[PDB]
C-alpha cells in the first residue's frame, strides 16, 4: 500500500504526469503564421497595457 503506490505517487508520478500534460499542451501548435502573429500581438498588448512596463 505505502511503499509501492502512495510514496511512488506523491513525489515522482504527479510531477511526471504534470510535465506530461504541460509539454503536450505547449507543443501542439498547428504551424500557422496568422496564429503566431496574433499571439505576438496579444503579447504586445498585454505587456503594454496590463503590465504597464513603461512606468
Amino acid at each position: 500500500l505505502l511503499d509501492l503506490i502512495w510514496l511512488e505517487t506523491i513525489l515522482p508520478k504527479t510531477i511526471s504526469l504534470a510535465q506530461m500534460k504541460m509539454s503536450t499542451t505547449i507543443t501542439s501548435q498547428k504551424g500557422l503564421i496568422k496564429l503566431y502573429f496574433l499571439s505576438f500581438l496579444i503579447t504586445i498588448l498585454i505587456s503594454t497595457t496590463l503590465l504597464n512596463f513603461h512606468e
Binding site: 501542439s28 498547428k30 500557422l32 496564429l35 499571439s39 496579444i42 498585454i46 496590463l50 504597464n52
Partner: protein, 140 residues
C-alpha cells in the same frame, strides 16, 4: 496589473472580507482573460460562439479560484485571529484546489492542486513576511 496586487496587499489581512474577495476575483479575472486570449490565439476556435464560450469558461474558473481563495483566507484569519500565520493561506490554497477539481471535474487533480497552490500561497505569505524579492534589483 501593478495596482491589483498592491490593492490586494493594501488592506490588512483577515479584517474585511468582500473587498479582499473581490480583489482576488479581479486578479483571477485578469489572469483568466490573459490565458483565454492566449488559448484562442495559438489554438483556433471552431466558431466565434465556441471561442467566447471558452473565454467565459476560463474567466469563470479563474474568478471562482480567486474568489474562493480570498474568501477562505478571510474566514480562516478571522476565526483563528492570526493575521501573520501562513496556515490560513495554505487552507485557502486547498480551497482553491478543491475549486479547481470541481470545475475541472476531477479528484486527484483537486488533491494535487490543494498541495501545490497551498504551498504556493504559503510561499507568498512568508515572502511578504520575510521580505523576499522575486525580481531583485541590482546592488553589486
Amino acid at each position: 496589473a501593478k495596482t491589483l496586487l498592491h490593492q490586494y496587499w493594501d488592506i490588512p489581512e483577515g479584517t474585511e472580507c468582500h473587498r479582499k474577495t473581490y480583489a482576488a476575483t479581479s486578479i483571477g479575472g485578469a489572469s483568466g482573460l490573459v490565458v483565454s486570449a492566449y488559448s484562442v490565439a495559438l489554438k483556433t476556435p471552431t466558431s466565434f460562439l465556441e471561442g467566447v464560450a471558452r473565454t467565459g469558461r476560463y474567466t469563470f474558473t479563474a474568478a471562482a479560484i480567486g474568489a474562493i481563495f480570498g474568501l477562505t483566507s478571510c474566514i480562516s484569519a478571522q476565526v483563528r485571529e492570526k493575521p501573520d500565520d501562513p496556515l490560513n493561506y495554505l487552507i485557502g490554497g486547498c480551497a482553491g484546489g478543491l475549486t479547481l477539481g470541481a470545475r475541472t471535474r476531477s479528484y486527484g487533480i483537486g488533491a494535487a492542486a490543494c498541495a501545490y497552490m497551498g504551498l504556493t500561497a504559503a510561499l507568498v505569505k512568508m515572502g511578504q513576511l520575510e521580505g523576499w524579492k522575486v525580481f531583485a534589483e541590482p546592488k553589486v
